[PDB]
Design a protein around this ligand. Sequence first.
Ligand code: CA
Length: 361
Amino acid sequence: GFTLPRQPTKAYECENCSQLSRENLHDKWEITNNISNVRRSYGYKERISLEQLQRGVIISTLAPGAVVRITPLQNKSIPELLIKTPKNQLLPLKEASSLYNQDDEVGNNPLAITKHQAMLQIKPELGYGKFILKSKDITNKYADAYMISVLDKFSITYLEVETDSLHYQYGDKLKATISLHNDITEYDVNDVDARLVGPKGQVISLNLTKLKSNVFEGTATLDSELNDRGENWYLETDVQTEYGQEIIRRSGHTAFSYSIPSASLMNVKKLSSKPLTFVVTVDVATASRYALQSVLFQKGEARPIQTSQRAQWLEPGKHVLQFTFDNLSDDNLYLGYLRLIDYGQLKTVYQYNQPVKLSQL
Ligand SMILES: [Ca+2]
C-alpha cells in the first residue's frame, strides 16, 4: 500500500452533472515515449462610451503604422468617425488609411470602415504619437459603448505577463508578474491595474506590489466556488506611463485553468499481478462522473507501455476504483502518474505525477 498526498475535497453546485453518463467503463490504449503562459502584448484594448467619443478619445502610438479596430458592444451602428493626427490635422477616419483601403474599386480590398465596424492601419506618413478619435455626431441609434483595440505593430515596447502556474485549484494563491519592456528605454511605471476574470464574468482583483521601476507582482486567492465547465480564466492587466511627451499604454492577457477539488485519491495498492490490477481509494464531495487515469512504465530506458482509464459515476463519499494493465516483472515496472478527472468540470481535480514503483504498492 502507498498513501498519496492528502487533498481536502470541496463540493460544488453542478447543473450539468445529472446529464453525465452512469456507465462504468474501463479503457486501455497503447502509447510511446505548454510549460509557461508568458504572453507579450504590443498594444492595448479599452472599452469606451459614446460620451467619450463625442469629447474625443486618445489613441496613443509609439511607431508608425499602428492598426486600430473599433467595434460596437451593442448590436447597433458605429458613428461617423473623425481622427485628429498628432499634428492636429482633423480628418475623416478613412483619410488616415491608405488610398488603397479608401478605394471601393479594388474588389479584393475589404470595406474596412462601415456603420457596423471600423478597422484601419494608420498611414506611415502620419507618423506616431497622440491621435484623437472623435464622433462626428451622436444619435439614439449608435451603440452606447465600443471596444477600441490598438496594435502598435511596429513598436519595440511590449508588456509581458505570466502566472506562476497554468493550473490552480480552490484556495490557491495566484502570483502574476507584469513587466513593461523596451531594449533602449528604462520606464518607471506607477499606473497599473490587474484582475482575474472567470468564465461567468466573476472578477477577482489582484493586489499589486512594485518590484522594479518597470516590474510589478500581483497576488490573489482563487476562491470561486463555481464550475468553469471546461472554460478558462484570464489575467487582464492595463498599464500606462509617460516617457517624455509620449504616452506608453499597454494591456495584456494570459489564460490559466482553475478547478474545484471535488474528489481526491488517497491510497493505491496492487490487487493482482495476472492481470496487473490496482485499486485506489477516492474521497468524493460532489456526485459526478469521474475518470481515473494511469500509465504503466517500464544505463536503462524508461518508457510508457500502456495507459488505463476507469470512468464511473460516483456519489459523495469514499470509493475504491480499480484499473488494469495488459503486460514483465514488478521490479522493471512503475506507475508514471495517477490523474482524476471530473467530467462535470472537464478538469483534472487530483493528480500525482511522481513515479510509483510497484514494489511500493
Ligand atoms: Ca488609469
